Amino acid sequence: MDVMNRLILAMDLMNRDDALRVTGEVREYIDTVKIGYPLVLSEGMDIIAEFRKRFGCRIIANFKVADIPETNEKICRATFKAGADAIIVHGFPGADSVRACLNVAEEMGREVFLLTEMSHPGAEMFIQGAADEIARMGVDLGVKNYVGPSTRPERLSRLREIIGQDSFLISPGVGAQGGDPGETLRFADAIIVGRSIYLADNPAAAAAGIIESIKDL
Amino acid sequence: VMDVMNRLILAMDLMNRDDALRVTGEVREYIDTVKIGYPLVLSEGMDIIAEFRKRFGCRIIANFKVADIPETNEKICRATFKAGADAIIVHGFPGADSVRACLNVAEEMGREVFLLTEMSHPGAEMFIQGAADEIARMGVDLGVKNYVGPSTRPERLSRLREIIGQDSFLISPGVGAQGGDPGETLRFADAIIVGRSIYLADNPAAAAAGIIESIKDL
Numbered sequence: 001m002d003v004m005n006r007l008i009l010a011m012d013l014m015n016r017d018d019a020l021r022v023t024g025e026v027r028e029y030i031d032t033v034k035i036g037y038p039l040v041l042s043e044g045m046d047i048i049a050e051f052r053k054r055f056g057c058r059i060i061a062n063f064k065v066a067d068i069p070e071t072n073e074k075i076c077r078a079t080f081k082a083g084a085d086a087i088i089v090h091g092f093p094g095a096d097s098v099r100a101c102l103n104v105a106e107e108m109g110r111e112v113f114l115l116t117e118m119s120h121p122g123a124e125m126f127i128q129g130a131a132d133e134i135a136r137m138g139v140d141l142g143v144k145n146y147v148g149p150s151t152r153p154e155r156l157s158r159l160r161e162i163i164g165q166d167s168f169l170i171s172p173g174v175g176a177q178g179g180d181p182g183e184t185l186r187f188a189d190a191i192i193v194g195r196s197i198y199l200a201d202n203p204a205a206a207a208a209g210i211i212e213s214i215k216d217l
Numbered sequence: 218v219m220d221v222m223n224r225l226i227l228a229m230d231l232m233n234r235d236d237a238l239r240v241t242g243e244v245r246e247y248i249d250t251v252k253i254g255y256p257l258v259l260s261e262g263m264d265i266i267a268e269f270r271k272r273f274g275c276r277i278i279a280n281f282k283v284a285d286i287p288e289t290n291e292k293i294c295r296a297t298f299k300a301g302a303d304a305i306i307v308h309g310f311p312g313a314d315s316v317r318a319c320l321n322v323a324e325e326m327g328r329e330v331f332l333l334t335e336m337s338h339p340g341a342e343m344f345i346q347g348a349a350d351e352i353a354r355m356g357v358d359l360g361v362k363n364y365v366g367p368s369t370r371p372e373r374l375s376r377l378r379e380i381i382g383q384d385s386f387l388i389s390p391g392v393g394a395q396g397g398d399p400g401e402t403l404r405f406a407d408a409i410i411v412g413r414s415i416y417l418a419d420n421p422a423a424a425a426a427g428i429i430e431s432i433k434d435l
């Protein structure tokens with residue numbers, strides 16, 4: 001996946017007008033947009049097609065899929081039907097649940113991103129201790145795309161070590177949550193940025209600023 | 218706690234609006250609490266919650282297994298309650314702050330949070346099971362009153378009931394298609410969740426009626 005400027009916009013605004021306007025203001029800097037439930041549950045799944053129609057961007061559905069196999073399959077189908085290019089899935093629910101997603105992705109020509117360790121404080125309670133094993137599980141299942149925490153570069157580095165250089169790794173927690181753009185890119189292929197851009201007084205300047213800080217990368 | 222008719226909750230996971238509406242309408246005389254998840258919502262929109270309320274006089278539990286950071290969890294809960302859901306199911310594995318975010322929104326909006334502890338599928342044994350007792354303990358400490366536990370593992374469901382106490386409300390999926398027994402599950406859970414055994418039946422109403430007949434004494 002060739003992410004322009006190694007920057008993925010997490011569009012979590014909950015108003016169609018604002019979401020489209022802000023994305024439009026930073027369109028020259030990105031070609032990959034991550035849409036999650038905040039926007040989808042507020043405006044509907046048709047918003048994905050609208051983004052592709054207006055921006056011709058790659059779409060990652062950050063749905064944190066975390067159900068049983070049968071339900072995970074249905075969620076992935078509905079998501080790809082809406083035009084998503086990839087979907088983010090939790091690894092904590094186990095191998096069968098991840099495999100369910102991989103099957104649908106393969107059938108519809110899409111990608112599955114395995115979330116191994118989250119970036120918020122609460123991730124330390126249960127997820128962190130299982131993160132390395134979840135990553136190894138991904139490797140065993142043939143997963144090639146992963147999600148790791150910008151807020152813990154040592155953990156992000158460990159994830160990169162487990163999955164190898166060939167695997168693709170994206171990382172949220174940059175900016176608002178405290179992660180540093182440049183440091184995160186030492187290990188991740190692309191950084192995910194939400195609020196630091198979409199809540200900025202001038203989103204375009206915010207995006208341009210982040211890119212300037214990682215220009216040599 | 219919510220008064221679930223016949224201690225039976227329908228997991229409406231059909232992805233077609235017409236079929237979902239038909240089946241739910243056919244079993245409404247037996248069930249007054251319906252659980253709507255992403256298979257239907259991502260296929261027909263959040264307005265489907267409103268339509269179910271309009272068409273049927275049923276309570277709605279949004280089975281969204283909320284599992285994001287606090288900031289995003291709050292947004293998901295807000296949008297879901299705004300749509301008319303009476304309650305929402307949240308994962309406990311992402312930690313206390315993520316669960317607290319959901320509880321805060323539920324409190325401010327006058328709705329309820331159900332904490333999913335251990336799941337009923339085989340994969341749950343890999344990571345969730347080992348953290349389930351603590352996840353439940355965490356819920357109790359946070360003031361969570363509603364929980365979800367696995368019907369497929371009677372011993373685990375029993376332990377979870379002990380941890381949360383008799384005053385807490387517990388619902389349990391995995392009944393029927395996944396192997397759980399209605400009666401056995403009701404020894405510990407206040408209500409059972411049933412999806413496919415009802416919605417894939419040739420006569421959903423008869424299927425629901427049959428399940429209720431098997432637990433009549435309960």
Ligand SMILES: O=c1cnn([C@@H]2O[C@H](COP(=O)(O)O)[C@@H](O)[C@H]2O)c(=O)[nH]1
Pocket residue numbers: 010012036062088115117118119120147148149172173174175176177192193194195196285286289
């Ligand atoms: O471990 C994490 C942390 N955050 N996110 C998501 O990445 C974005 C981070 O946004 P932010 O830049 O505004 O913090 C949000 O969409 C959030 O749900 C994840 O997928 N996993």
Ligand SMILES: O=c1cnn([C@@H]2O[C@H](COP(=O)(O)O)[C@@H](O)[C@H]2O)c(=O)[nH]1
Pocket residue numbers: 067068071228230254280333335336337338365366367390391392393394395410411412413414
């Ligand atoms: O641990 C579990 C297992 N299943 N479910 C949900 O309960 C329903 C079970 O449906 P079934 O009766 O068709 O197996 C589905 O909506 C499934 O996502 C949960 O919330 N948690």
